[PDB]
From Swiss-Prot, chains A, B:
This is Tryptophan synthase alpha chain. It catalyses: (1S,2R)-1-C-(indol-3-yl)glycerol 3-phosphate + L-serine = D-glyceraldehyde 3-phosphate + L-tryptophan + H2O. One of its GO terms (biological process) is L-tryptophan biosynthetic process. Pfam families: Trp_syntA.
Length: 258, 258
């Protein structure tokens, strides 16, 4: 539906980088999560990265792990997540919606049925976070068949071989994480290979990291856990939670004008 | 085959905690990896946790991520991993072998065929690191049908409800990661619910953390990345690599007598 392409062209109009918050769907409840997402959008978030609750405790930090636990504790299921996605899309027809999920989600229903469901509710992109590039073909092909952008991660030490693969396979945006190479170097190479615009997603904790990413040439930044941390710290006061989310998104967008 | 039960009873004879190193199969090559594993065993490792190369770059630290990349760069496939596992078991018939892997590995062949292959090569336990407990039943049942211990992770804030589930579902050992609760408290509750012996697996970097785990009552410790770091730092000298691995395992076992 051109949602990412239109966003990045309009961000070019505004001379801004994208700010894309991550939240877990259904954290800390279905309705609070919907209102958290409305607040992020109203405060200036350019796109959304939304997680279907998963479990990766060996690797995840306490923030993301606790969010997954809060959503499961609220009884959140993939079914409810897809209904939430549909509602978000209906209220916000133009905002790019990226799903972040883990491979076992597609076991119960099958790869094509999963991507068909994404297409039906209006998702724009899907990142299956735990599938190596060597095993990505069935996901990439199913995504394209259903008009979904498959998101590929560019790791910090990617050689030109891998950069060429990431640039060619992905659509929508490139999820950049940056024997690491210089940030500006990865960005330049991805542009040389006509990759989808790069969103720096590593360690985007606060305004300084957004500004650094845009100054290095990235198209924007993805905040992997900073929004979830504000949720966790304000669980007892939804009003203060929403106010802190607004000031945070505002400060992150200010950094995106750097 | 009683490999974990026999190990823990013999560790009780020795008044020792278990030390269980993690390595990625095929890192930095098939034959170097086999010899790394032989060296860990000869140096005193009590069991093995072996990873089939995966990809979890959003969450993994550089050590584990780089190991996965080194193994894929050596052309390692799941097929070669299963042959390596078979060779390790043939050379070392009594040592408990735990596989650590990610869910997409079971997509290509199916859940039952994966666990059948594990049983055939002599694996004792399987931890599918990225499957929530709410979705674990098909894996747990397939494991039991093939005489494989399914490994469950006890997270640091587990309530008694979850502790009861982890204690009942798992076999072999409990993979302990420790609003977190006191380490000794989780250990006590797991014993109260007759869980498989707990191996503390969070942050086991050096001897101090092994000693802390055993002093708190854990049956031992799993070093998630410390062995891989020694591999990465000594890639240019296999001889020095193996010598540093020996001194490291020796120091970790010394801490396990605490
Ligand atoms: Cl679109
Ligand atoms: Cl529940
Ligand atoms: Cl290169
Ligand atoms: Cl695109
Ligand atoms: Cl950087
Ligand atoms: Cl982060
Ligand atoms: Cl056994
Ligand atoms: Cl290769
Ligand atoms: Cl409780
Ligand atoms: Cl057992
Ligand atoms: Cl601790
Ligand atoms: Cl670790």
């Amino acid at each position: 539906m051109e949602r990412y392409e239109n966003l990045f062209a309009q961000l070019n109009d505004r001379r801004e980088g994208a700010f894309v918050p991550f939240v877990t769907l259904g954290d800390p409840g279905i309705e609070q999560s919907l209102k958290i997402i409305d607040t992020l959008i109203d405060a200036g978030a350019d796109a959304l990265e939304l997680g279907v609750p998963f479990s990766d405790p060996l690797a995840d930090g306490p923030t993301i792990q606790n969010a997954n636990l809060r959503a499961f504790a609220a009884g959140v299921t993939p079914a409810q997540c897809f209904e939430m996605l549909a509602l978000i899309r209906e209220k916000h027809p133009t905002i790019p919606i990226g799903l972040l999920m883990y491979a076992n989600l597609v076991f119960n229903n099958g790869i094509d049925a999963f991507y068909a469901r994404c297409e039906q509710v209006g998702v724009d992109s899907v990142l299956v976070a735990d599938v190596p590039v060597e095993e990505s073909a069935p996901f990439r092909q199913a995504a394209l068949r259903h008009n979904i952008a498959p998101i590929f991660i560019c790791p910090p030490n990617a050689d030109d071989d891998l950069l060429r693969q990431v640039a060619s396979y992905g659509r929508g945006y490139t999820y950049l994480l940056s024997g690491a190479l210089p940030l500006h170097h990865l960005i330049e190479k991805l542009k040389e290979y006509h990759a989808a615009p790069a969103l720096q997603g590593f360690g985007i904790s606060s305004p300084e990291q957004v500004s650094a990413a845009v100054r290095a040439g990235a198209a924007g930044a993805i905040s992997g856990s900073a929004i979830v941390k504000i949720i966790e710290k304000n669980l007892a006061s939804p009003k203060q939670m929403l106010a802190e989310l607004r000031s945070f998104v505002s400060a992150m967008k200010a950094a995106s004008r750097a």
